Amino acid sequence: SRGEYVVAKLDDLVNWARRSSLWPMTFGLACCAVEMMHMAAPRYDMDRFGVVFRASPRQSDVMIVAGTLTNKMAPALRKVYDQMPEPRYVVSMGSCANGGGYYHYSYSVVRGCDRIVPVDIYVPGCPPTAEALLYGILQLQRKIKREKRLRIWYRR
Amino acid sequence: PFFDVQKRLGLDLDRWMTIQSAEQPHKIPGRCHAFEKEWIECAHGIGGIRAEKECKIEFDDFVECLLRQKTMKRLSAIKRQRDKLIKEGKYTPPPHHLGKEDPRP
Amino acid sequence: AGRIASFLKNAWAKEPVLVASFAIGGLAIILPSLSPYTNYAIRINRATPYNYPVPLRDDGNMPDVPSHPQDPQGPSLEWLKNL
Amino acid sequence: MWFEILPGIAVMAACLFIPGMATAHIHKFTNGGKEKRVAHFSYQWNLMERDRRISGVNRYHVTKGLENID
Amino acid sequence: MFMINILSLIIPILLAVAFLTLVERKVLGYMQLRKGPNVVGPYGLLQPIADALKLFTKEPLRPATSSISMFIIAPILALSLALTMWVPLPMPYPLINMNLGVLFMLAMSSLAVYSILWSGWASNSKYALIGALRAVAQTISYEVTLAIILLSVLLMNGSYTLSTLITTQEHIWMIFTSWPLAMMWFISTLAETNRAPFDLTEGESELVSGFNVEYAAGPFAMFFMAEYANIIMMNAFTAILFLGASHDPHTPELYTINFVLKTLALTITFLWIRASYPRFRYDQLMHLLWKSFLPLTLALCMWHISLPIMTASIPPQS
Amino acid sequence: MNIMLTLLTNVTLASLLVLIAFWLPQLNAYSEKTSPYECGFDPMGSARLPFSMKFFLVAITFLLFDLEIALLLPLPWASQTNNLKTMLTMALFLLILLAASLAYEWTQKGLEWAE
Amino acid sequence: MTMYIAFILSTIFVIGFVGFSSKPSPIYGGLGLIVSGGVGCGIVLNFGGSFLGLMVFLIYLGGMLVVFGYTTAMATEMYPEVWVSNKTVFGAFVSGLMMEFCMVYYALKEEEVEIIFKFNGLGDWVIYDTGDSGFFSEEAMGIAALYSYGTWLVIVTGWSLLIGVVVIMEITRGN
Amino acid sequence: MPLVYMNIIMAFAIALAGLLMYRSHLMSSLLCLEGMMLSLFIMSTLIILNTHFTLANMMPIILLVFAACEAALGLSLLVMVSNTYGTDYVQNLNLLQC
Amino acid sequence: LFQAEKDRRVLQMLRENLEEEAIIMKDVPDWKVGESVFHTTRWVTPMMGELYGLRTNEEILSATYGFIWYT
Ligand SMILES: CCCCCCCCCCCCCCCCC[C@@H](O)O[C@H](CO[C@H](O)CCCCCCCCCCCCCCC)COP(=O)(O)OCC[N+](C)(C)C
Ligand SMILES: CCCCCCCCCCCCCCCCC[C@@H](O)O[C@H](CO[C@H](O)CCCCCCCCCCCCCCC)COP(=O)(O)OCC[N+](C)(C)C
Ligand SMILES: CCCCCCCCCCCCCCCCC[C@@H](O)O[C@H](CO[C@H](O)CCCCCCCCCCCCCCC)COP(=O)(O)OCC[N+](C)(C)C
Ligand SMILES: CCCCCCCC/C=C\CCCCCCCC(=O)O[C@H](COC(=O)CCCCCCC/C=C/CCCCCCCC)COP(=O)(O)OCCN
Ligand SMILES: C=C(C)[C@H]1Cc2c(ccc3c2O[C@@H]2COc4cc(OC)c(OC)cc4[C@@H]2C3=O)O1
Ligand code: SF4
């Protein structure tokens, strides 16, 4: 069918643009943020993949939870997640964000940020190296490549 | 009230700008230089009361130059009659009033 | 003689921008009144014929007025080409 | 690399070339190829309108030389 | 056929802005010992296209507490004015030939600030308001000095016509006559375009996003395009003003190439400056413009009024 | 006429870009998403509250100084007059009084922002 | 009647005046005055006054920027008013629009006398000059003659501006 | 008089009316003062251009200058009033009676 | 030369308008054809409503706004 071919090509084009231009929110919680900085530094240079930090949630596509999420902080993380225009993605980075980690049995720690927001990629480590975070980012790009919103819409 | 220090000292603080017939830059004339010159000359030195009655012809011509009210009335009376004459159809305006003229240098 | 020198030294050490601006403004005020070329500029501004030179009616006793543009009478612009 | 910056600068330079060259070519094309006349003052506009009147085709650019003097 | 000219001016400007962004990222990266975009396309040549396609397919957000009419009008005004400032520039022939082209650019640049003002106010958020008020202070700082500098420089031209500037600099660049004015003009253009070290309105480290913090998707993209088109436009204006290329009426493309090269050099200097200096404080910007630039500018204005009369150097035009 | 066409074209292009930006993508607007942004926590007061101007006197002064550029802008044409001595005296007179205005405001602490 | 450009521009001028004369939030009022300034610049351009129109537009852009800055500080009014936010403001705006349209209609097809004199329309193109000469702009020469003829005007204007600086500094001193 | 002159005069009348009918904000009235100045500028420029009075071409510029002095004056007063009340409402200026 | 041709052009347009006025207002009650509006008998420069009054809107627009709109 011609229509199916057209929606497939438009799907690929949109998927390509989104993966290519991923803007994470300038947002860091704890130790893991330091490795995030090392991903932006010369050695790795995330900017060369089209990945640039932007402070505003309105101009951001990706949230990287890089650090422990405490109970006091969870409403603010949820709020800045909700202020991201869609499509939006969340990368959970480090043991603390993934499941609580070293502070899993604390009265003031959220046992995993996926209780608060939906997570796309879980990056293990304490902290994950800058290379491991880069691997997770490229995995998120690969996942975005697989999405077929237009094909799904056409089939409806 | 009016203390005429400009006349007393011959200083000319603001009289250069009172009328449009008074020494413009590059001798550029006003639109009504002749009319205002004639009106000013006619009324010079006879006083305000006399000038209003005796120089009314010059002043009326000057005002007609300034606002052109009679000219617009005459043109409107011309074009209304032309519109009436064409609407019922016995005028047929000439080809040089429609764009078919042979222009001259 | 000695106070003004110390004041100038202090001003140059603390506010050189103000010293430079005051010097430039003072030169701009003073120098035009001491220049020989200031007259020439006026003459140049007088030689530019913005409007038409309306001819005069020859009354018969007008020697210095030319009868033709190329006649030797009248103003000359020879000083301008050599400038 | 530093010479890998050059391709982007070349693309930008090529893009910035287009407006001026396009304006020059369009001016030549619509003005008879003899440059667009400039009218900053009413005397130049009067010359242009006289040219349009005497051109016989309502175009200021068409020029009538000494072949109109019998 | 004039419409074709309008399009031939508009579309290439937008393409140059899109690639200017790629150039800034690459220049800043190499100045920071890294590479910058080099994956999305060869040498990152497709990165601007991906950025544009991403921004125009993302969700535009209208804030709940915002005023919609101004919120939507402001980016339109910004982009349309940025495109309008290009029409009187002679490269070497302008699209629109104006007697007072300099005054036209002055007035439209003055009107361009209201995009930032109305955007910040209509966002109805505190950071946007702080950015808008910083724009107010910035304009107050630079406007008087910029106008007086332009007047002082154009006392050598004889008019406000931009094409006459080509004739004025037929033998020498005007920067050899007025480099003290050129330095202050360059800094004032940095302030006027909201560029680092004078980029107070965005205030990224300080105010997160400044005036457009609440803008997303396409409207934000329009603000970004307007800003970069303004960078290019102001540098082209400076290149025409101070580094005048020689124009052959039978080969205008030589002038076009020379002018474009000079404009690129000045824009790259802008990007070079952004990677070298810390940000000003905005009251410090006001004090710099009012206590240093203003007195020197006044003095140099008097000097440039007196000098042509002193040396019989008054330019031709009425 | 050409400038009017240019302005219409630019405004039309910008408005079309806004319309595409608002009608092409998928919108999922909800109350949390449209709430004002203040770094993750809800704002305390209104953004429509009085925001003090500390440079208020410079702003008033800018009004007068801006009108002086209007007086100095016809200077290029004034240099073409025959009375260059009168013209130059007036041009310098206006710039000296402009500088004196700045000197008075500077010395009387008018250029300092309020604390 | 040709293209109705001048009449359209003057109508937009009046509409902007009605907008800021309604006395809504100053931010909105400032916008209406900016619209009026731009449109008045267009009107003056359509008559040969390029410099005067551009100068007035620039001056009012600067003044309205200062007014915006002052409004955010001293005229804020937590729920600011747009023309449709209040019955008084909307009523004044509608009254202004209706009164302008009524005057235009009464002066357009017929020829009424309102206060001073009458009008038939005819377009403003009728009253032009036909003068054909010049390598200069008459408006520019008239404005430039301020430095040779208007010596007294320059003196009084400069003194007034210096005194204005002194006066504003005296008024806001307080104590 | 053409329609443009009556439109300019109507603009002046609307602004004068706006000035006279006070609402609450003082700044709203200063804006009507500015509008009256703008209407006068346009009117006098149109008259001057039409009659080709070359010398008069400098008077609107002068007219602009004293427009700023009047605006800067008014804003200055608006500061002091606000500093007394935290509001620019004209209702607060009721200490003196007739 | 330009003045000599401009005089003839203006005079020819005025004469053509006069010849058309003689025809249009033949049967208007007391219309005096070619009557001036000024008391004085000296020459008055025409108003451009007197020259282009009976002509098409294209040349009227070009005569009024042609120079101003040319960019
Ligand atoms: C007049 C025009 C109007 C519309 C203009 C829109 C812009 C034009 C379209 C531009 C498209 C360019 C983008 C496509 C480039 C694809 C790049 C290519 O390399 O992607 C490959 C795959 O390509 C994509 O699957 C398809 C991309 C293109 C899809 C079809 C595009 C059709 C365009 C039609 C335009 C229609 C416009 C509709 C609106 C009018 C896989 O690469 P990737 O895996 O990432 O690489 C990872 C990094 N590695 C390699 C180093 C590891
Ligand atoms: C680069 C600058 C120039 C660009 C040049 C092209 C200009 C493009 C135009 C700009 C708009 C872009 C929008 C593209 C998507 C279409 C959106 C809308 O127009 O379509 C629907 C319009 O349909 C409406 O439901 C109404 C349909 C019928 C009711 C009134 C229409 C009457 C017309 C009669 C049609 C019958 C056949 C006509 C044959 C000619 C609205 O659906 P809606 O969900 O809200 O909007 C979100 C769109 N999504 C889904 C893609 C995300
Ligand atoms: C009798 C009063 C003396 C004591 C009281 C002082 C109060 C008055 C303030 C100053 C008085 C000066 C005003 C005099 C009128 C100026 C016009 C006249 O004098 O000629 C001008 C002479 O102007 C010269 O530049 C010299 C006078 C300028 C004086 C400098 C300004 C100082 C004023 C300071 C006091 C004002 C208030 C305080 C401000 C600091 C130009 O003439 P010119 O161009 O040949 O020919 C014009 C005719 N054309 C065009 C057809 C060819
Ligand atoms: C003859 C022509 C005069 C006019 C031409 C000049 C044109 C415009 C130039 C002046 C513009 C206005 C100047 C404003 C004056 C400022 C006064 C002032 O406030 O000064 C103090 C500082 O004191 C000074 O005034 C600086 C020194 C005194 C003035 C500068 C020098 C005066 C003249 C010097 C040059 C004279 C000619 C050069 C001689 C060459 C040597 C042979 C300011 O510093 P603060 O803000 O308090 O610093 C706080 C942070 N630490
Ligand atoms: C923007 C670039 C090039 C780097 C710098 C940077 C990031 C990402 C995130 C942040 C950041 O710096 C800021 C400021 O300094 C710290 C210091 C921190 O601890 C050392 C910390 O931990 C949460 C967070 C921060 C900020 C932060 O979140 O990439
Ligand atoms: S996972 Fe480890 S490195 Fe990361 S924030 Fe938690 S404790 Fe620090």
Coordinates of N, CA and C in Angstrom, one line a residue, chain G residues 10-11 13-14 17-18 20-24 29 33 36-37 40 44 47 49 52 56 60 64 67 70-71 74-75 77 81 86 89 99-100 103 117-119 121 124 127 129 138-139 142-143 145-146 149 157 160-161 167-168 171-172 174, chain H residues 1-4 6-8 10-12 14-15 18 21-23 25 27-29 31-32 34-35 37-39 41-42 45-46 49-50 52-55 57-58 60-62 64-66 69 72-73 75-80 82 88-89:
Chain G
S10 N -5.2 56.3 8.9 CA -5.8 57.2 9.9 C -6.8 56.5 10.8
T11 N -7.6 55.6 10.2 CA -8.6 54.9 11.0 C -7.9 54.0 12.0
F13 N -5.0 54.6 13.3 CA -4.5 55.6 14.3 C -5.6 55.9 15.3
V14 N -6.8 56.2 14.9 CA -7.9 56.5 15.8 C -8.3 55.3 16.6
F17 N -5.8 55.0 19.4 CA -6.1 56.0 20.4 C -7.3 55.6 21.3
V18 N -8.3 55.0 20.7 CA -9.4 54.5 21.5 C -9.0 53.4 22.4
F20 N -6.0 53.0 24.0 CA -5.3 53.5 25.2 C -6.1 54.5 25.9
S21 N -7.1 55.1 25.3 CA -8.0 56.1 25.9 C -9.1 55.4 26.8
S22 N -9.2 54.1 26.6 CA -10.1 53.2 27.4 C -9.7 53.1 28.8
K23 N -8.4 53.3 29.1 CA -7.8 53.2 30.4 C -7.8 51.9 31.1
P24 N -7.3 50.8 30.4 CA -7.1 49.4 30.8 C -5.8 49.3 31.4
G29 N -2.2 49.5 27.3 CA -2.3 50.9 26.9 C -1.0 51.3 26.2
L33 N -0.6 52.7 22.2 CA 0.2 53.9 21.8 C 1.3 53.5 20.8
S36 N -0.3 53.1 17.5 CA -0.6 54.5 17.0 C 0.6 55.2 16.5
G37 N 1.8 55.1 17.2 CA 3.0 55.7 16.7 C 3.5 55.2 15.4
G40 N 1.0 56.4 12.7 CA 1.3 57.8 12.4 C 2.6 58.0 11.6
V44 N 2.7 59.9 8.0 CA 3.7 61.0 7.6 C 4.6 60.5 6.5
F47 N 3.3 61.2 3.0 CA 3.2 62.6 2.6 C 4.5 63.3 2.4
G49 N 7.2 63.1 4.6 CA 8.0 63.3 5.8 C 8.7 62.1 6.4
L52 N 10.6 62.9 9.9 CA 9.7 63.2 11.0 C 9.0 61.9 11.5
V56 N 9.6 60.3 15.2 CA 8.5 60.2 16.2 C 8.3 58.7 16.6
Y60 N 8.8 57.4 20.5 CA 7.8 56.8 21.3 C 8.1 55.4 21.6
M64 N 7.8 54.4 25.5 CA 7.0 53.3 25.9 C 7.7 52.2 26.6
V67 N 7.9 53.4 30.0 CA 6.6 53.3 30.6 C 6.3 51.9 31.0
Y70 N 8.1 51.2 34.2 CA 7.5 51.9 35.3 C 6.2 51.2 35.7
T71 N 5.4 50.6 34.7 CA 4.2 49.9 35.0 C 4.4 48.7 35.8
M74 N 5.0 50.3 39.5 CA 4.1 51.2 40.2 C 2.6 51.2 39.7
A75 N 2.3 50.3 38.8 CA 0.9 50.2 38.3 C 0.5 48.8 38.0
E77 N -1.3 46.0 39.7 CA -2.7 45.6 39.8 C -2.9 44.1 39.4
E81 N -6.1 44.5 33.5 CA -7.4 44.6 32.7 C -7.1 44.6 31.2
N86 N -13.6 44.0 31.7 CA -14.4 44.9 32.6 C -15.4 45.6 31.7
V89 N -14.3 49.4 30.7 CA -13.3 49.5 29.6 C -13.9 49.1 28.3
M99 N -18.4 55.7 17.7 CA -18.3 57.2 17.4 C -17.4 57.4 16.2
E100 N -16.3 56.8 16.1 CA -15.4 56.9 14.9 C -16.1 56.5 13.7
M103 N -18.9 59.0 12.8 CA -18.3 60.3 12.1 C -17.9 60.0 10.7
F117 N -15.5 72.5 10.1 CA -15.8 72.6 8.7 C -16.3 71.2 8.2
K118 N -16.4 71.1 6.9 CA -17.0 69.9 6.3 C -15.9 69.1 5.6
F119 N -16.4 68.0 5.0 CA -15.5 67.1 4.2 C -16.4 66.3 3.3
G121 N -14.6 63.8 1.3 CA -13.8 62.6 1.0 C -12.7 62.9 -0.1
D124 N -7.1 61.9 0.2 CA -6.2 63.0 0.5 C -5.2 63.3 -0.6
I127 N -4.9 67.2 -2.7 CA -4.4 68.5 -2.2 C -2.9 68.6 -2.4
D129 N 0.9 69.0 -4.5 CA 1.5 70.2 -4.9 C 1.8 70.2 -6.4
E138 N 13.2 68.6 0.8 CA 12.8 69.9 1.4 C 12.6 69.7 2.9
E139 N 12.0 68.6 3.3 CA 11.9 68.3 4.7 C 13.2 68.3 5.5
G142 N 14.6 71.8 5.7 CA 13.8 72.5 6.8 C 14.2 72.1 8.2
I143 N 14.4 70.8 8.4 CA 14.9 70.4 9.7 C 16.3 70.8 10.0
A145 N 17.8 73.5 8.9 CA 17.9 74.9 9.2 C 17.8 75.3 10.6
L146 N 17.6 74.3 11.5 CA 17.5 74.6 12.9 C 18.8 75.1 13.5
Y149 N 19.1 79.0 11.3 CA 18.0 79.9 11.5 C 17.5 79.9 13.0
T157 N 15.6 75.2 23.9 CA 15.4 73.8 24.0 C 16.5 73.2 24.8
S160 N 16.0 74.1 28.5 CA 14.9 73.4 29.0 C 15.3 71.9 29.3
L161 N 16.1 71.3 28.5 CA 16.5 69.9 28.7 C 17.5 69.8 29.9
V167 N 15.5 69.2 37.4 CA 14.2 69.2 38.0 C 13.8 67.8 38.4
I168 N 14.0 66.8 37.5 CA 13.7 65.4 37.9 C 14.6 65.0 39.1
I171 N 12.9 66.5 42.2 CA 11.6 66.0 42.6 C 11.7 64.7 43.4
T172 N 12.5 63.8 42.9 CA 12.6 62.5 43.5 C 13.6 62.4 44.7
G174 N 13.2 63.5 47.7 CA 12.4 63.2 48.9 C 12.9 63.9 50.1
Chain H
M1 N -11.6 70.4 4.5 CA -10.7 69.5 5.2 C -10.9 68.0 4.8
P2 N -9.8 67.3 4.4 CA -9.9 65.9 4.0 C -10.2 65.1 5.2
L3 N -10.5 63.8 5.0 CA -10.8 62.9 6.0 C -9.7 62.6 7.0
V4 N -8.4 62.7 6.5 CA -7.3 62.4 7.4 C -7.2 63.5 8.5
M6 N -9.6 65.2 9.8 CA -10.6 65.0 10.8 C -10.3 63.7 11.6
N7 N -9.7 62.7 11.1 CA -9.2 61.6 11.9 C -8.2 62.0 12.9
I8 N -7.3 62.9 12.5 CA -6.3 63.3 13.5 C -6.9 64.1 14.6
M10 N -10.0 64.0 15.6 CA -10.8 63.0 16.4 C -9.9 62.3 17.4
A11 N -8.7 61.9 16.9 CA -7.7 61.3 17.8 C -7.3 62.2 19.0
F12 N -7.1 63.4 18.7 CA -6.8 64.4 19.8 C -8.0 64.5 20.7
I14 N -10.4 62.2 21.4 CA -10.4 61.0 22.1 C -9.4 61.0 23.2
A15 N -8.2 61.4 22.9 CA -7.1 61.4 24.0 C -7.5 62.4 25.1
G18 N -10.0 61.0 27.1 CA -9.4 59.9 27.9 C -8.7 60.5 29.1
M21 N -11.5 61.8 31.7 CA -12.2 60.8 32.4 C -11.3 59.8 33.1
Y22 N -11.0 60.1 34.4 CA -10.1 59.3 35.1 C -10.7 57.9 35.6
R23 N -9.8 56.9 35.6 CA -10.3 55.6 36.1 C -9.6 55.5 37.4
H25 N -5.7 54.2 37.8 CA -4.2 54.4 37.6 C -3.8 55.8 37.1
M27 N -0.8 56.4 35.8 CA -0.1 56.1 34.6 C -1.0 56.0 33.3
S28 N -2.2 55.5 33.5 CA -3.2 55.5 32.4 C -3.5 56.9 31.9
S29 N -3.4 57.9 32.8 CA -3.6 59.3 32.4 C -2.4 59.9 31.7
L31 N -0.4 58.3 29.9 CA -0.5 57.7 28.6 C -1.4 58.6 27.7
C32 N -2.5 59.1 28.2 CA -3.4 59.9 27.4 C -2.7 61.3 27.1
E34 N 0.5 61.6 26.6 CA 1.4 61.3 25.5 C 0.7 61.2 24.2
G35 N -0.5 60.5 24.2 CA -1.3 60.4 23.0 C -1.7 61.8 22.5
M37 N 0.0 64.5 22.8 CA 1.2 65.0 22.1 C 1.4 64.4 20.7
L38 N 1.2 63.1 20.6 CA 1.4 62.4 19.3 C 0.4 62.9 18.3
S39 N -0.8 63.1 18.7 CA -1.8 63.7 17.8 C -1.5 65.1 17.3
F41 N 1.6 66.3 17.1 CA 2.7 66.1 16.2 C 2.3 65.8 14.8
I42 N 1.4 64.8 14.7 CA 1.0 64.3 13.4 C 0.2 65.4 12.6
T45 N 2.6 68.2 11.5 CA 3.5 67.7 10.4 C 2.7 67.7 9.1
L46 N 1.4 67.2 9.2 CA 0.6 67.2 8.0 C 0.4 68.6 7.4
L49 N 3.8 70.0 5.9 CA 4.3 69.3 4.7 C 3.4 69.7 3.5
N50 N 2.1 69.8 3.7 CA 1.1 70.2 2.7 C 1.3 71.6 2.1
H52 N 4.1 73.3 2.2 CA 5.5 73.4 1.9 C 6.3 74.5 2.6
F53 N 6.0 74.7 3.9 CA 6.6 75.7 4.7 C 7.8 75.0 5.2
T54 N 9.0 75.3 4.6 CA 10.2 74.7 4.9 C 10.8 74.9 6.3
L55 N 10.8 76.2 6.8 CA 11.3 76.5 8.1 C 10.5 75.9 9.2
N57 N 9.4 73.1 9.3 CA 9.7 71.6 9.5 C 10.5 71.3 10.7
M58 N 11.1 72.3 11.4 CA 11.8 72.1 12.7 C 10.8 72.1 13.9
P60 N 7.9 70.6 14.7 CA 7.4 69.3 15.4 C 8.5 68.7 16.2
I61 N 9.8 68.7 15.7 CA 10.9 68.2 16.5 C 10.9 68.9 17.9
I62 N 10.9 70.3 17.8 CA 10.8 71.0 19.1 C 9.6 70.6 19.9
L64 N 8.3 67.7 19.9 CA 8.6 66.5 20.6 C 9.5 66.7 21.8
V65 N 10.4 67.6 21.8 CA 11.4 67.8 22.9 C 10.6 68.1 24.2
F66 N 9.8 69.1 24.2 CA 9.0 69.4 25.3 C 7.9 68.4 25.7
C69 N 10.0 66.3 28.3 CA 10.1 67.1 29.5 C 8.8 67.0 30.3
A72 N 8.7 63.1 31.4 CA 9.6 62.9 32.5 C 9.2 63.5 33.8
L73 N 8.6 64.7 33.7 CA 8.0 65.4 34.9 C 7.0 64.5 35.5
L75 N 6.1 61.3 35.2 CA 6.7 60.0 35.8 C 7.4 60.3 37.1
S76 N 8.2 61.4 37.2 CA 8.8 61.8 38.4 C 7.8 61.9 39.5
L77 N 6.7 62.7 39.3 CA 5.7 62.8 40.3 C 5.1 61.5 40.6
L78 N 4.8 60.6 39.6 CA 4.2 59.3 39.9 C 5.1 58.5 40.8
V79 N 6.4 58.7 40.8 CA 7.3 58.0 41.7 C 6.9 58.5 43.1
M80 N 6.9 59.8 43.4 CA 6.8 60.2 44.8 C 5.4 59.8 45.3
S82 N 3.7 57.2 44.5 CA 3.7 55.8 44.8 C 4.5 55.6 46.1
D88 N -0.4 53.9 42.7 CA -0.5 55.1 41.9 C -2.0 55.5 41.7
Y89 N -2.9 55.1 42.5 CA -4.3 55.4 42.4 C -4.5 56.9 42.7

